[PDB]
Amino acid sequence: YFQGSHMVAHGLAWSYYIGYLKLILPGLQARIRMFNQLHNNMLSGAGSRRLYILFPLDCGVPDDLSVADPNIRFRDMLPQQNTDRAGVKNRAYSNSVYELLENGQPAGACILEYATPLQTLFAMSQDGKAGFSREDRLEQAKLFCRTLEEILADVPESRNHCRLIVYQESEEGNSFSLSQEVLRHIRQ
């Protein structure tokens, strides 16, 4: 295996930064402050004010987080950002806030989502026209993560809000609890 120079993953990483994260990081905290005004400071500490992105390396990305763990419960959306983009007026960028339950009660809350490009990788893997194996998919998923981390390293601290939660579903165990993992990241 020789890793190519500009692979699918490289492009996805750059896409994900240039076309989302870079766009939303400047206003994220303002949106959070607004949310807190409505929700009695639900997102109180710094740890609850990060943008946590789930990165399942097997690329299983359900649209509903509660599917992954029923202890991840949707609470409300942040106020949305609207931006004119590439001829689409008022394109909307949105994020969702979840409560993390322990014993049926909220133990934390945070902004949580999956990394969307992992959906692309999964779909490519399922289409013969794509020419893309399961082995290719895993490697690309790992490369996407590494490349993204490299790009994010260069963000100034005032915009250093992304936090990646990287795991491989097949390697975890029946005792893996995604909500606990997220709470662990919040707590660190």
Ligand X SMILES: Nc1nc(=O)c2ncn([C@@H]3O[C@@H]4COP(=O)(O)O[C@H]5[C@@H](O)[C@H](n6cnc7c(N)ncnc76)O[C@@H]5COP(=O)(O)O[C@@H]3[C@@H]4O)c2[nH]1
Which of residues 20 and 167 has its CB atom nearest to ligand X in the complex?
20
Phi/psi at 14 (5° precision): -65, -40
What count of Cα atoms within 13 Å lies in the side-chain half-sphere of residue 5? 0
Residue whose beta carbon is closest to ligand X: 19
Contact flag: residue 109 with its own copies (CB under 8 A)? no
How many CB atoms are closer than 10 A to CB 129? Answer: 6
The yes or no reply on residue 16 touching ligand X (CB under 6 A) is yes
* Nearest approach, Cβ of residue 15 and ligand X (Å): 4
Would you tell me how many other CB atoms lie within 10 Å of the CB of residue 166?
A: 16
* Angle between helical axes of 8-16 and 134-152 (0-180°, round to 10): 40
CA dist 86 and 91 (Å) reads: 9
Q: Does 140 bind ligand X (CB under 6 A)?
A: no
Q: Is 14 in the site for ligand X (CB under 6 A)?
A: no
> What part of residues 85-124 is at the interface with ligand X (CB under 6 A)?
86, 88, 91, 93-94, 113, 116-117, 119-120
| Binding-site annotation: residue ranges for 2',3'-cGAMP | 15-20, 91-94, 116
